[PDB]
Design a protein around this ligand. Sequence first.
Ligand code: HEM
Ligand code: HEM
Ligand code: W67
Ligand code: W67
Ligand code: H4B
Ligand code: H4B
Ligand code: ZN
Lengths: 413, 409
Amino acid sequence: CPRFLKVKNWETEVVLTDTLHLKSTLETGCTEYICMGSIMHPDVATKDQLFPLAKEFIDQYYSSIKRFGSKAHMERLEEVNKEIDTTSTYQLKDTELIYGAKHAWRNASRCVGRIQWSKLQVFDARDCTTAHGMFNYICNHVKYATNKGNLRSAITIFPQRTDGKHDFRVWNSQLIRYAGYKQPDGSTLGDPANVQFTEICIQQGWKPPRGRFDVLPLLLQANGNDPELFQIPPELVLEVPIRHPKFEWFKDLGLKWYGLPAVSNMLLEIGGLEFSACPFSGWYMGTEIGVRDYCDNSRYNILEEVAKKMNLDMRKTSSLWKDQALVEINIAVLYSFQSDKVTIVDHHSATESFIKHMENEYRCRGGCPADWVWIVPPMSGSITPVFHQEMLNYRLTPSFEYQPDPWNTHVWK
Amino acid sequence: RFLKVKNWETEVVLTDTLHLKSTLETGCTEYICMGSIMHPSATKDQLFPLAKEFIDQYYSSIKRFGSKAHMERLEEVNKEIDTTSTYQLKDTELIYGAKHAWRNASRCVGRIQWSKLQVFDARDCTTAHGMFNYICNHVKYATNKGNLRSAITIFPQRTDGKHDFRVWNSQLIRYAGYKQPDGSTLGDPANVQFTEICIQQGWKPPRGRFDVLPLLLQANGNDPELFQIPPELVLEVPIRHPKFEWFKDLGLKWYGLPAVSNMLLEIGGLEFSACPFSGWYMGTEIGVRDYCDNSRYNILEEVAKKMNLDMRKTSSLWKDQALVEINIAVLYSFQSDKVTIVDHHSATESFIKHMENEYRCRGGCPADWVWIVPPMSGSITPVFHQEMLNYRLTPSFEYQPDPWNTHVW
Ligand code: HEM
Ligand code: HEM
Ligand SMILES: Cc1cc(N)nc(CCc2cncc(CCCN(C)C)c2)c1
Ligand SMILES: Cc1cc(N)nc(CCc2cncc(CCCN(C)C)c2)c1
Ligand SMILES: C[C@H](O)[C@H](O)[C@H]1CNc2nc(N)[nH]c(=O)c2N1
Ligand SMILES: C[C@H](O)[C@H](O)[C@H]1CNc2nc(N)[nH]c(=O)c2N1
Ligand SMILES: [Zn+2]
């Protein structure tokens, strides 16, 4: 591959030069003959595979702390070696773990919020042994990160994978989601996306309130055991009721959302170690709720009802009635959240901040991988600066990765 | 391998077999994806297999593979490349190759129309004056008094690079951009440089906001020459809003005919360096990009004024609100003037049905998500949720250098 690749911003004519792609460790799905850039998703590591992966990460860590080739660098390397050789694995020091987590976020090509990458509270839960223990650790995460509305980004890292039969997993794809219930008549109450998961919870013994906005319990799996249900204390789940600054009727829609966005289904990869339960949280970009959660057809799908209360001509599509409502909805989302002093960023601010971030990363690190398809907001795309920004996408390690759904893989005891 | 593409709204899965038939690179590799890069990066021996394969797919597409018609044609092309280092397409082959370059255009959301293409063979052309006549007839035909019709005009192929036919205008119809003293820019800032080349060539500009640039036509490697399209041929739409009576007072208008004239049509290893093609507008091209891009007409702020919007924080989404109203007015104007136009909801809806057709009958449809998804209201259109595979099928429209960077006078 060529040593320097060039990206161009077509609005400002600014050109950036990427050398960091040279450090790419994983495949993208693309080949020279086909591009998968818009495909959403394109038993354990052996001693021989583990050795070079660990060394790679160790070198990189001591390179970050400006002690490359130092006595402590060679000593850490030999210790990790000795350990992989005797135990087929090794354990990260707390410093390495925190560095690894921060960088996994730094390398997350789909995340537009990465300007904040180095401010990340890391909770080491590697001593956890039970699901009740996971529940404790998670509750602490939530209360900390929520911070009464002034959100702070946090990750909680549970023990690494060992033999594959003793995985820690959060079954919830996100820590906080609303239930979805499928009626006999074919309609769906709640959040239709979560119908399968809700069903799982119900089977496990969850008594459903059958409402539009019922917070799902946690379904926690420790040490490869069957998962266990727990209810998050409602006092720990901060929510924002949606209202509109101009339209007083908007509040009559009975809408609300949760303040804390937190992913719990991904796998954290550091130095060849796999952390299968590593829930992380930041704060919301308005469009995530106002556009996707609310306006996707297989989600809350409120465009129609909102348009009606707006007295919009809805026979032609060229009236653009869908669009007009969308903007209002997203205004009401940012307004509710700010009025309740819960941290939220609009899509203009977030994308602007990301460009400055990207530019700085090219300047200091020789590149910044980015997935244009994910980075560009799902509304008003071209009036945000990222739309006109060329981006190279490649996978750096440490990383957050996808993993199969646990209910597809679990061997029920 | 057979690849699957999933729409994440309907859960429809399509199996792509077509991609196995491609041979041009996309620029990506296993480790680096360049799907958001806009411009990623012929002898007798080179030319023949290219020629061979294309004749092969033509006789395959018309169900006469192995026929004597097929055989002779293969022998005919052989002898002609042999003795002239090039070869000439049959008319039927020209029309197929044009329609199929459109069909293979991964960046075009309009492809459901691909087989309804009017093809004007201008390969007998020899002078700029010729090109100008051919182009005027194109324009008049395709405009059709508002009921637009897809057209392409194809000039003589490349032979030796030194005798290239080129339309210097990136598009057939665009407005002039003027660089003011005070540093502001009049007209369309994107054309500023070209506008000034035209002036430097003898063009007397009216220095207004919407001045139709003249045609700059290069024939057979020669210096390009200026020609003004007759005004009566250039259909234009005044932009008014249905509810906002003040919108007319913004003084906005656009041309009704979108016609790309800077690309290269490639067929059977032949290079048609001059091949303007035209269609009709999707409303967002004008309403979003042309008008609201900071580097273009940049009307967003001015519009936001007249809507009496709070423009202090971005979180008031005032830019968004003004944008939707601009695009309503555009659609509304064209429609009121019986000028053909498609809204991005219908356009994207059409593209999805087209993808179904292509998978059903052809085993896939190359598509560039970055270009297919409209520049506004992305996820409330069907294609945002549609996985698409991009790959390069031939015949194709490729980019080419700007002529004012390679032409010797
Ligand atoms: C601090 C403020 C943050 C903001 C404003 C932000 C913003 C976003 C947005 C808008 C998305 C797209 C989400 C979607 O459409 O599903 C996203 C995705 C993502 N973010 Fe961030 N994020 C933040 C924090 C974090 C943190 C703390 C981490 C990890 C430590 C992270 C890693 C990721 C990853 C891995 C994805 C991909 C999600 C997926 O593949 O499903 N982000 N982020
Ligand atoms: C008939 C109705 C058509 C519609 C609604 C349509 C729609 C569009 C749109 C919206 C774009 C993006 C334009 C931009 O962002 O600059 C595009 C690109 C494109 N179209 Fe179509 N188009 C149509 C006809 C055609 C025809 C007749 C051809 C060729 C014979 C064609 C070939 C292409 C190509 C090659 C591109 C890529 C342009 C580039 O690379 O800059 N289209 N189309
Ligand atoms: C760290 C982080 C920050 C942020 N702004 N958003 C996220 C994703 C938030 C999120 C919350 N509830 C539900 C979802 C579902 C997304 C569904 N996608 C994967 C199809 C996503 C994560
Ligand atoms: C065939 C065709 C159909 C269509 N609907 N749009 C187009 C684009 C036409 C077009 C007209 N004037 C100006 C432009 C500028 C494009 C600017 N891009 C290249 C940066 C483009 C072409
Ligand atoms: C098909 C396509 O890849 C898919 O709909 C993507 C598009 N871009 C996205 N971007 C973000 N941030 N989140 C998403 O879920 C998606 N979905
Ligand atoms: C950076 C990116 O490649 C560039 O801005 C592209 C994005 N998608 C686009 N899509 C269309 N239809 N037209 C464009 O000009 C662009 N520009
Ligand atoms: Zn790619």
